[PDB]
Design a protein around this ligand. Sequence first.
Ligand code: OGA
Ligand code: MG
Ligand code: NI
Ligand code: ZN
Length: 331
Amino acid sequence: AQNPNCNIMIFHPTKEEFNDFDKYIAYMESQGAHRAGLAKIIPPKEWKARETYDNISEILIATPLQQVASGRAGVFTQYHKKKKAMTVGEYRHLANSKKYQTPPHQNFEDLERKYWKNRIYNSPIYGADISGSLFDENTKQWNLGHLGTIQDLLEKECGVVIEGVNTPYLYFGMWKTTFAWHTEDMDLYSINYLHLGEPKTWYVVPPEHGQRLERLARELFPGSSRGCGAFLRHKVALISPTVLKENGIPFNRITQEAGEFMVTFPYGYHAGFNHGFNCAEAINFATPRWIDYGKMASQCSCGEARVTFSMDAFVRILQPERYDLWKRGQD
Ligand SMILES: O=C(O)CNC(=O)C(=O)O
Ligand SMILES: [Mg+2]
Ligand code: NI
Ligand SMILES: [Zn+2]
């Protein structure tokens, strides 16, 4: 078995190997990359996402989210408070202000310490989940707006044509902006490209150990757990690396820098934070190996998780027994 310790693997495809996305994902899996739950892909030196980032300031963040924490430094939840619209230019200025800017630090490790120590005492503002793309239409390789769709994959594997579309999202981040512990909708893959700015630190639990994370989370968030059998779908809970180590949960960590791709694999729980002003683009995708995960994915039916139009058909076709209860949650 390849990669039996479930370490995060880092790939350096050549320009030739960067042509066929599906084939390269399948290559990574042949080397065991999926066992970690997350891989890093460094694009060939010849490649670029677009020519420059000099003209992005007029993009609108219609609903910036202020991430307010409750709990203790290592075990907390966050809720999102809606703020007034602002442009990317306005947001970048706010990120760089004395109130929100990254503190002085020595290295990534020092910054990570400062994050876990101090995150709860501040409420950073995240521009998340903005439909759109920063890839140039002429970028042919690993263009996240031109991937094969999940609907077409389900059709190719299972023969059923379904409604729905699959498009990318932009994330504008600042110091301490946080992504809570989650897997993707329907335990899909994700791919994330850091277009510009400061790094993003990730933590991940191997898919084969995801249930260990879930059991810890039920112990650490006992009211949430009683409210919903899949409350990590709410994307509100944070657990620090110190706390995971104390409880014997297997995980790994890696820092993503500008120009790098991360791929999350089905049922790979992940969480993390942004180091400073940045912009990432991400999208879900599927492969033939996903289908079995989609069939087994947990669902939130308490009504909190409320998700895209396109998840309907996935539940309907892959989880017909669950469909009725799940749709009651959506309505
Ligand atoms: O970048 C972020 O805030 C969160 N991204 C993801 O969880 C992802 O790409 O799967
Ligand atoms: Mg603009
Ligand atoms: Ni994710
Ligand atoms: Zn729920």
